[PDB]
């Protein structure tokens, strides 16, 4: 429910967070199951608005 | 100019003031764009709200 309230403008902030967490491999495997569940839930909920955006930089981060 | 936005979901456990429901709307003009607003009356999914401003983002009202 907490992630559901989030406006989209913070989701881009949230995705930018996971990107930065990926560099630090220690954190990634320490909290891998949690990062996965939140990440995939953010994408499913507001999928429609995510794809519509044409920002290339967002595309690389998802890459 | 006033925009029309259809609610797609009525957020729950938002801790809003009694009688104010926090909802997520998508604009009819641009179906992709979404914004979170506060509604005063009885609201359900798929009904249309008349937004005077499309810039403000809803905040929890205590």
């Amino acid at each position: 429910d907490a992630l559901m309230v989030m406006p989209f403008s913070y989701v881009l902030k949230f995705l930018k967070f996971i990107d930065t967490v990926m560099q630090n491999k220690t954190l990634l495997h320490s909290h891998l199951p949690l990062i996965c569940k939140n990440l995939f839930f953010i994408i499913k909920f507001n999928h429609k608005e995510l794809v519509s955006q044409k920002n290339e930089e967002l595309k690389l981060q998802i890459n | 100019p006033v925009t029309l936005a259809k609610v797609i979901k009525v957020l729950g456990r938002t801790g809003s003031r009694g009688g104010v429901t926090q909802v997520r709307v998508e604009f009819l003009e641009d179906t992709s764009r979404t914004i979170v607003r506060n509604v005063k009356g009885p609201v359900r999914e798929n009904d249309i709200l008349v937004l005077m401003e499309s810039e403000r983002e809803a905040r929890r009202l205590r």
């Binding site: 989030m6 | 456990r13 938002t14």
Partner: peptide
């Protein structure tokens, strides 16, 4: 005080 979701935004 702040609720879940709202704390995450400030974070």
């Amino acid at each position: 005080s702040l609720k879940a979701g709202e704390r995450l935004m400030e974070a």
